[PDB]
Write an enzyme that holds these catalytic residues in place. Structure first.
Site, PDB file in Angstrom:
ATOM      1  N   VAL B  60       0.789  -1.252   0.000  1.00  0.00           N
ATOM      2  CA  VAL B  60       0.000   0.000   0.000  1.00  0.00           C
ATOM      3  C   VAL B  60       0.826   1.311   0.000  1.00  0.00           C
ATOM      4  O   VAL B  60       0.244   2.402   0.005  1.00  0.00           O
ATOM      5  CB  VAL B  60      -1.121   0.026   1.091  1.00  0.00           C
ATOM      6  CG1 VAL B  60      -2.099  -1.131   0.887  1.00  0.00           C
ATOM      7  CG2 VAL B  60      -0.546   0.053   2.518  1.00  0.00           C
ATOM      8  N   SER B 132       0.436   4.931  16.215  1.00  0.00           N
ATOM      9  CA  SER B 132       0.852   4.274  17.458  1.00  0.00           C
ATOM     10  C   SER B 132       1.413   5.287  18.454  1.00  0.00           C
ATOM     11  O   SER B 132       2.286   6.097  18.106  1.00  0.00           O
ATOM     12  CB  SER B 132       1.932   3.204  17.185  1.00  0.00           C
ATOM     13  OG  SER B 132       2.268   2.458  18.368  1.00  0.00           O
ATOM     14  N   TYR B 144       0.935  14.374  18.640  1.00  0.00           N
ATOM     15  CA  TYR B 144      -0.399  13.768  18.523  1.00  0.00           C
ATOM     16  C   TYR B 144      -1.492  14.672  19.098  1.00  0.00           C
ATOM     17  O   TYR B 144      -2.472  14.960  18.412  1.00  0.00           O
ATOM     18  CB  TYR B 144      -0.436  12.337  19.093  1.00  0.00           C
ATOM     19  CG  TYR B 144       0.124  11.351  18.095  1.00  0.00           C
ATOM     20  CD1 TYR B 144      -0.672  10.845  17.063  1.00  0.00           C
ATOM     21  CD2 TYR B 144       1.450  10.947  18.157  1.00  0.00           C
ATOM     22  CE1 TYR B 144      -0.157   9.952  16.116  1.00  0.00           C
ATOM     23  CE2 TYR B 144       1.976  10.056  17.228  1.00  0.00           C
ATOM     24  CZ  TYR B 144       1.166   9.564  16.210  1.00  0.00           C
ATOM     25  OH  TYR B 144       1.680   8.684  15.289  1.00  0.00           O
ATOM     26  N   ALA B 145      -1.300  15.145  20.329  1.00  0.00           N
ATOM     27  CA  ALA B 145      -2.268  16.033  20.970  1.00  0.00           C
ATOM     28  C   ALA B 145      -2.619  17.279  20.146  1.00  0.00           C
ATOM     29  O   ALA B 145      -3.799  17.649  20.090  1.00  0.00           O
ATOM     30  CB  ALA B 145      -1.812  16.433  22.404  1.00  0.00           C
ATOM     31  N   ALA B 146      -1.621  17.921  19.516  1.00  0.00           N
ATOM     32  CA  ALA B 146      -1.877  19.159  18.721  1.00  0.00           C
ATOM     33  C   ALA B 146      -2.793  18.946  17.486  1.00  0.00           C
ATOM     34  O   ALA B 146      -3.558  19.845  17.099  1.00  0.00           O
ATOM     35  CB  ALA B 146      -0.561  19.862  18.327  1.00  0.00           C
ATOM     36  N   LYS B 148      -2.299  18.887  14.319  1.00  0.00           N
ATOM     37  CA  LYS B 148      -1.987  19.662  13.117  1.00  0.00           C
ATOM     38  C   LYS B 148      -1.248  18.883  12.027  1.00  0.00           C
ATOM     39  O   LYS B 148      -1.496  19.110  10.834  1.00  0.00           O
ATOM     40  CB  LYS B 148      -1.176  20.919  13.483  1.00  0.00           C
ATOM     41  CG  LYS B 148      -1.894  21.861  14.446  1.00  0.00           C
ATOM     42  CD  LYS B 148      -1.528  23.319  14.190  1.00  0.00           C
ATOM     43  CE  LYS B 148      -2.598  24.275  14.740  1.00  0.00           C
ATOM     44  NZ  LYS B 148      -2.441  25.663  14.187  1.00  0.00           N
ATOM     45  N   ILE B 177       0.142  -3.043  22.581  1.00  0.00           N
ATOM     46  CA  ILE B 177      -0.802  -4.108  22.254  1.00  0.00           C
ATOM     47  C   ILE B 177      -0.025  -5.410  22.183  1.00  0.00           C
ATOM     48  O   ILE B 177       0.989  -5.466  21.511  1.00  0.00           O
ATOM     49  CB  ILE B 177      -1.587  -3.832  20.889  1.00  0.00           C
ATOM     50  CG1 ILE B 177      -2.284  -2.456  20.879  1.00  0.00           C
ATOM     51  CG2 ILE B 177      -2.588  -4.954  20.543  1.00  0.00           C
ATOM     52  CD1 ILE B 177      -3.185  -2.135  22.069  1.00  0.00           C
TER      53      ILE B 177
END
Lengths: 202, 237
Positions: B60, B132, B144-146, B148, B177
């Protein structure tokens, strides 16, 4: 999906509160339905085909919250979840809702058993409260999460409510709450989940 | 079932999480296009299912493989209702240099699957991307939190663009996991990661699959642009 479980529901006479009661009952839950509006709550619970009690209370009052959770435990022995819809029940009203969220959350925290689930509604505010309690209660295995509905249900004006071009339905917020209360979300805690058609994507 | 009458395309379908999703979606009535790079692992995985399913060997990160896998999916099933892109976390459990190319190549695959899914998914459809949050420090979490940049930026940008067509876009952020590829981890690193998650354990493949099923089914029809953390609270602090 909720078979064997007891769920306490605040704001249970409200549109969203009521859609939750109906969905949780069809999924096998036993229910403690709590609201300040005596008349509508009596009607809401009568309609259920489930083990349910109705408790008239003001969840901003520390003594009434104490009474609510004691009645739940007396009736069903054990509490597995709390869905706090009175968090979405203008300056003074918001302050009183925050007080109720704090009191219901802290009491749920002491009373909920391992694997239990607390769903609040809306570092600061309700999200900051949920994340702080998520950290405190992870020792017990209790999960704490927050649902943030957008505009929940002329038809043309509703197109501008969200990128998806519609308002939400009470049943859709209820469906998000079911996910978070069920064993399908056992490893999810501290999460703020918007049910708003993309409205908050700013 | 919770996915009855729906056709779902699943990338990373031979991996731990991908394979638990195939099994769960099949049990819930979905018909499936299972996609992965490893042929023998994918052939075995699909054979065991008792569902309407085709297996397609494809990379992919290759734009022509992506066009072909989506064309095959439509020729087989007529229409497509969801895409669960678990290749977005391929080689998660594995040298800074080699780690960067894994992230870079994964982001390439996420771009291409997301755009093509955006083209072919019909009204009310659901694209589930992945990233992840296992092993991240202060800056990884801020990224990740932002929301953008990276995978969350992609999903939030696509959510806005596809909302007119009625297509939802969300992202799943699994933490630690327990898959077979995680067995070959030094115990000190495994424990460091368990110790960083407030719930005090690793997640199961099945739990990430249940989060994806919620996001693909009609029970989340009003939810788009969301990052859903399946990390036992690891990212809170």
């Amino acid at each position: 999906r909720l078979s064997g479980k007891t769920i306490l529901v605040t704001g249970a006479a409200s549109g969203i509160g009521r859609a939750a009661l109906d969905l949780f009952a069809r999924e096998g839950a036993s229910l403690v339905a709590v609201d300040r509006e005596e008349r509508l709550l009596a009607e809401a619970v009568a309609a259920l085909e489930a083990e349910a009690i109705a408790v008239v209370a003001d969840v901003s009052d520390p003594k009434a919250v104490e009474a609510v959770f004691a009645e739940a435990l007396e009736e069903f022995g054990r509490l597995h979840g709390v869905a706090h819809f009175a968090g979405v029940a203008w300056e003074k009203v918001l302050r009183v809702n925050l007080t109720g969220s704090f009191l219901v959350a802290r009491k749920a925290g002491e009373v909920l058993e391992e694997g239990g689930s607390l769903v609040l509604t809306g570092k600061l505010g309700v999200v900051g409260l949920a994340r702080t309690l998520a950290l405190e209660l992870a020792r017990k295995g209790v999960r704490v999460n927050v649902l943030l509905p957008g505009l929940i249900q002329a038809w043309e004006q509703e197109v501008g409510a969200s990128p998806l071009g519609r308002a939400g339905r009470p049943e859709e917020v209820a469906q998000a709450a079911l996910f978070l209360l069920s064993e399908e979300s056992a490893y999810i805690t501290g999460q703020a989940l918007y049910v708003d058609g993309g409205r908050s994507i700013v």
